[PDB]
Structures are given as structure tokens and as C-alpha cells.
């Protein structure tokens, strides 16, 4: 489909406590002398 015309929604979303959404814990020559 062409779908000419799409509105945008710019807001201050994605607010969290610096954690990961997943229930699971957030995944993290040499010298030689002559």
C-alpha cells in the first residue's frame, strides 16, 4: 500500500530507572632486553 500521510508523535517517553525491561538481569609483541 502507498499510505500517503503519516502523523508523528514526539514525546518524552522511555522513562525508567536505568534498568533492563527484561525480567532477566540486564546482560552486561612484548618487551625484551638485549
Amino acid at each position: 500500500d502507498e499510505t500517503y500521510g503519516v502523523n508523528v508523535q514526539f514525546e518524552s517517553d522511555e522513562e525508567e530507572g536505568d534498568e533492563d525491561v527484561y525480567g532477566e538481569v540486564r546482560e552486561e609483541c612484548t618487551l625484551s632486553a638485549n
Binding site: 536505568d18 527484561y22 525480567g23 532477566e24 538481569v25 540486564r26 546482560e27
Partner: protein, 56 residues
């Protein structure tokens, strides 16, 4: 042991799993669930840096 058994069952240690030992021990185990986890793995020498911060 929980991490190795989760790997055995192809599972990722959950923060809830960490919740069982919510920040257990002197260090906060919870950190295992922080987002910057990957970024902080390169922040070597941070204790000495914090100690030297008094000069800046």
C-alpha cells in the same frame, strides 16, 4: 550456580532471580540488572579514579 544452571537450560539469569538475593552480600547483586552493565565492563580503574577525584 544459578547462572550455570540457567545456561544449561538456555536461560538468562533474571533480575527476579537476583531478587532472591536482592543485592545480597556487601556488594549489590542488583547491579547485575543495571542497563549500563555492558558499558561499565570497560570502566577499569574506577576505585582509584574516585579516590583521586579529590584533586580535581
Amino acid at each position: 550456580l544459578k547462572r550455570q544452571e540457567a545456561i544449561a537450560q538456555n536461560r538468562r539469569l533474571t533480575l527476579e532471580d537476583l531478587e532472591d538475593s536482592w543485592d545480597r552480600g556487601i556488594p549489590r547483586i542488583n547491579t547485575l540488572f543495571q542497563k549500563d552493565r555492558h558499558t561499565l565492563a570497560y570502566d577499569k580503574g574506577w576505585r582509584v579514579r574516585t579516590d583521586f577525584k579529590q584533586y580535581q
